Amino acid sequence: PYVEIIEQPKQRGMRFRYKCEGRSAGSIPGERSTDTTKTHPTIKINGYTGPGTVRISLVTKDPPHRPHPHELVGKDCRDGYYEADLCPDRSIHSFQNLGIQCVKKRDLEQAISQRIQTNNNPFHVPIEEQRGDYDLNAVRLCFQVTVRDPAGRPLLLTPVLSHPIFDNRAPNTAELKICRVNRNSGSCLGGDEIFLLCDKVQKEDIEVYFTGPGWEARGSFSQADVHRQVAIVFRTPPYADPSLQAPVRVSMQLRRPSDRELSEPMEFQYLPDTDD
C-alpha cells in the first residue's frame, strides 16, 4: 500500500503563532477550502482498509527533509507531531485541527534536540546533515502511516510530503495585494506617475505588470521608490499603440519575479493623447 494526498494544505494566508501568544495555532485549511465549503488536509491509503495509525510531522521544504524546529500543535499533538488512529472502515482521512507553532531562533538548538530525542526524523537524516540553516518561514507536512500486512504485523508505509506551507509574515512568499491606487487611467504615451499602496513587498523583488491580449509591459521605478515595503511610486509604460483613438482597458497587477506570483488584476485605461 501507499499514501496519497488528495487535499493539500493551503500554502499561504496562515500566520505561524509563537508559544508566547498562547492560542494553539488555529487549523490548517485544505487547498480548495472556502467560507461556504470548509475543507481540511486529506490523505488516501491505496491498497489497504483496516486498523492503522498516522503520525504527521513537520519537515524542511528542501532536501534533505530534516525535521523542522517548528511544532504541530492541537488535539492529539505531542512533542511537535500529531499521532492518532485511522478509521478502519474508510481509506480517506482528514485532519481538522493541525496548527503550526513557530520556535524562536534562540530556542532552535533545543527544538532540534527534541526532534532527535523523540525519534521525530521520518527520513532518518544523519545529525551531521542536520547542521545548516533552516527556513523558518516554510514547512512541509510529512504523513507517516502505519498499517498491517496480510499476516497482521505493523507495516510502516513510505512517508509522503505535502506542498510547502508558508508563514504569511514572510513577504517573499506572501500573497500580493494592491490596497489603494491614486490613478487608474493614463496617456497611451505612458509616463504618468502612480502611487500604489500594497501589502508588504521586498523592494528588490517586485514589479508592476501591465497586460492585455498579446501585450506586456512594466511600470518604471527604482528600489528607492518603494517606501517602507508598502508603497510604490512608479511611471506607467507606454501602451503598444501610441495613436489610440479611444480608451483601451488593460490589466495592472503586482508581480514578484522570483516565483512569478501575481496579485489580483485591476482595471487600467490607456487614453488617447492629443499633444503635449
Q: Element (H or E) spanning 42, and its range?
A: strand 42-46
Nearest to 239, CA basis, from 171, 192, 274: 192
- Closer CB to a copy of itself, residue 125 or residue 231? 231
Q: Does 249 bind DNA (CB under 7 A)?
A: no
CA distance linking residue 165 with residue 27, whole number of Å: 12
**Alpha helices (runs of H) in the chain, residue ranges in sequence order:** 108-117
CA 36 to chain CA centroid, Å, is 22
Q: Does 169 bind DNA (CB under 7 A)?
A: yes
- Closer CB to DNA, residue 9 or residue 99? 99
- Closer CB to a copy of itself, residue 191 or residue 242? 191
CB of 149 to a copy of itself, least distance (A): 55
Residue 90 binds which of a copy of itself, DNA, none (CB < 5-8 A, kind-dependent): none
CA distance linking residue 269 with residue 186, whole number of Å: 7
Strands 138-148 and 99-101: unpaired
- Report in angstroms the alpha-carbon separations of 243 from 47, 96, 194: 65, 57, 22
Using CB under 7 A, which of the segments 16-24, 47-55, 120-128, 253-261 binds DNA? 16-24
CA distance linking residue 162 with residue 7, whole number of Å: 9
Residue 26 binds which of a copy of itself, DNA, none (CB < 5-8 A, kind-dependent): DNA
CB of 221 to a copy of itself, least distance (A): 12
- Closer CB to DNA, residue 115 or residue 239? 115
Q: Does 39 bind DNA (CB under 7 A)?
A: no
Residue 144 binds which of DNA, a copy of itself, none (CB < 5-8 A, kind-dependent): none
Using CB under 7 A, which of the segments 58-66, 97-105, 247-255, 265-273 binds DNA? 97-105
Nearest to 70, CA basis, from 136, 20, 161: 136
Length of the chain: 276
Using CB under 7 A, which of the segments 102-110, 138-146, 155-163, 213-221 binds DNA? 102-110
Kindly state the DSSP code that residue 107 receives in the 8-state scheme: G
Nearest to 266, CA basis, from 186, 199, 180, 187: 180
CA distance linking residue 235 with residue 191, whole number of Å: 5
- Closer CB to a copy of itself, residue 130 or residue 269? 269
In one letter, which amino acid is 255?
R
Residue 193 binds which of DNA, a copy of itself, none (CB < 5-8 A, kind-dependent): a copy of itself
Residues lying near a copy of itself in the complex (CB under 8 A): 179-180, 182, 193, 195, 197, 200, 227-228, 230-231, 233
Q: Does 97 bind DNA (CB under 7 A)?
A: yes
CA distance linking residue 29 with residue 15, whole number of Å: 12
- Closer CB to a copy of itself, residue 111 or residue 178? 178
Judged by the rule CB under 7 A, the positions of this chain that interact with DNA are 13, 15, 18-27, 74, 97, 99, 102, 104-106, 136-137, 169-172, 200, 202-203, 226, 228-229
